[PDB]
């Protein structure tokens, strides 16, 4: 509360560390469904159904331009990518499986880096 603060957790490396995690996600072999925004002209249903599209390139640009106020808003956008994928794709599809694999990969790096 006012003039009463928990001890200051060092957040000075968060930007660099989120960038590293993002590089690792970008270079994973199963990243291909997620590298670029879904083409809303060419994929029926996407625009109407997925209210907040997100992809790794968009996260990379947001990261690079100071549009994440803290590491939790970064994690929210990464998870959004996988949540969108599960919304639109069957579990038993190449894309659906890619999304589960990537979410797993991300959540481990997240825990190991920060928790």
Curated annotation (Swiss-Prot):
Ranges where the Bromo domain occurs: 9-113
Subcellular location field: Nucleus
Tissue specificity of this protein: Expressed at varying levels in several tissues, whereas a smaller transcript was expressed specifically in testis.
Family per similarity comment: Belongs to the WAL family.
Quaternary structure note: Component of the BRF-1 ISWI chromatin remodeling complex, at least composed of SMARCA1 and BAZ2B, which regulates the spacing of histone octamers on the DNA template to facilitate access to DNA. Within the BRF-1 ISWI chromatin remodeling complex interacts with SMARCA1; the interaction is direct. Component of the BRF-5 ISWI chromatin remodeling complex, at least composed of SMARCA5/SNF2H and BAZ2B, which regulates the spacing of histone octamers on the DNA template to facilitate access to DNA.
Functional note: Regulatory subunit of the ATP-dependent BRF-1 and BRF-5 ISWI chromatin remodeling complexes, which form ordered nucleosome arrays on chromatin and facilitate access to DNA during DNA-templated processes such as DNA replication, transcription, and repair. Both complexes regulate the spacing of nucleosomes along the chromatin and have the ability to slide mononucleosomes to the center of a DNA template. The BRF-1 ISWI chromatin remodeling complex has a lower ATP hydrolysis rate than the BRF-5 ISWI chromatin remodeling complex.
Record protein name field: Bromodomain adjacent to zinc finger domain protein 2B
Name of the gene: BAZ2B
